[PDB]
């Protein structure tokens, strides 16, 4: 996150950290069994990551569980970044607190104008690198589909909106990847790609939740 704020430990409940060994990328807690990312942090050997402030230390609040499956959109395609969205089950179910819960699913989609919290362990730097360890947290309005598909022409489809300052300054970046965009309590986006980080008329692009519910909630039916 570059041009955020230190959200505060276990103050964003639902946000999990994906490690592999190491943090590489961030998801949202939907139920007691499974995390909500983006289709390109899809990978072998997940270990979800629950109850995380700072990630290099353990603090008392964690829960570790593995992956027991991962599901990347039926659609997913890598190239135009289209679904950049996957669903992935835990081996065990997480003891949900008020530290470690889930953040509900939208019943309708947000329009440009609303203020979301965008939030992850990313870097924080917009040319250099550096990566804060503890949470870091964004607070950035929706911007209108014209707007977005003007900052990116030929790119934007019906499945992802921009969000963020066309000002640059202020956005999601990368290790950010696959976390929450959450509006009035719902998750509405998952950070998914953008032209580098916080560069002007270049905001980020997030991947359309609202589109998602219906495969959500059939794919956890039957999974
Ligand atoms: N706003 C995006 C965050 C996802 C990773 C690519 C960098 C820019
Ligand atoms: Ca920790």
Same mark, same amino acid.
């Given at each position: 996150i570059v041009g955020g704020y230190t959200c505060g430990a276990n103050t964003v409940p639902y946000q999990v950290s994906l490690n592999s060994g190491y943090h590489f990328c961030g998801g949202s807690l939907i139920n007691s069994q499974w995390v909500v990312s983006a289709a390109h942090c899809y990978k072998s050997g997940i270990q979800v990551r629950l /109850?995380?402030?700072? #990630?290099?230390?353990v603090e008392g609040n964690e829960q570790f569980i593995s992956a027991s499956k991962s599901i990347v959109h039926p659609s997913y395609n890598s190239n135009t970044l289209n679904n950049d969205i996957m669903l #992935? &089950?835990? &081996?065990?179910?997480?003891s949900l607190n008020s530290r470690v819960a889930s953040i509900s699913l939208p019943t309708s989609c947000a329009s440009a104008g609303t203020q979301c919290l965008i939030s992850g362990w990313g870097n924080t730097k917009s040319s250099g690198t550096s990566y804060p360890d503890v949470l870091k947290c964004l607070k950035a309005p929706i911007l209108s589909d014209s707007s977005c598909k003007s900052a990116?022409? /030929?790119q934007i489809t019906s499945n992802m909106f921009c969000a963020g300052y066309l000002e640059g300054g202020k956005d999601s970046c990368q290790g950010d990847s696959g976390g929450p965009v959450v509006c009035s309590g719902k998750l509405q986006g998952i950070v998914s790609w953008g032209s580098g980080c916080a560069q002007k008329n270049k905001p980020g692009v997030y991947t359309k939740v609202c589109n998602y519910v219906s495969w959500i909630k059939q794919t956890i039916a039957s999974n």
């Open positions: /109850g995380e402030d700072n #990630i290099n230390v #992935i &089950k835990l &081996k065990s179910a997480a990116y022409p /030929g």
